[PDB]
A paper describes a structure:
cAMP response element binding Protein 3 ([name]) is an endoplasmic reticulum (ER) membrane‐bound transcription factor, which belongs to the basic leucine zipper ([name]) superfamily of eukaryotic transcription factors.
The X‐ray structure provides evidence that chCREB3 can form a stable homodimer. The chCREB3 [name] has a structured, pre‐formed DNA binding region, even in the absence of DNA, a feature that could potentially enhance both the DNA binding specificity and affinity of chCREB3. Significantly, the homodimeric [name] possesses an intermolecular disulfide bond that connects equivalent cysteine residues of the parallel helices in the leucine zipper region. This disulfide bond in the hydrophobic core of the [name] may increase the stability of the homodimer under oxidizing conditions.
Numbering used by the authors:
A (entry chain B): 217 to 278
B (entry chain A): 210 to 277
The structure:
Amino acid sequence: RKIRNKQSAQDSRRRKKIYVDGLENRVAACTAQNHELQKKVQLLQKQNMSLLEQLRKLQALV
Amino acid sequence: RLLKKVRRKIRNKQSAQDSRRRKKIYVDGLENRVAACTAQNHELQKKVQLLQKQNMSLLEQLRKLQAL
């Protein structure tokens, strides 16, 4: 019936809003996380440089 | 106002059609960020992974030269 679909259409829309808000929030944090994940590679690249320096400093040092 | 209402009500309808035709793009937009940001995030994690054991093998090389 034409009423049956109206309240079925209301839900679809009420529910889309949730889904969009869902992507908004994944996009949100997966991004903010991706970022701090990169800061972790950074601080790790900088640790590897100061570590190998400390090493070879006593390493090839005779 | 005779046709004010017959225009001001049509003008609104296909302004509403665009809004919806345009959200479809935006959603598809998030779908694609969520897509790659995710696939990227992990490859990013694999880089921290290989980097963490680089640091494990060198710090052991170092602290290996102690009483030595």
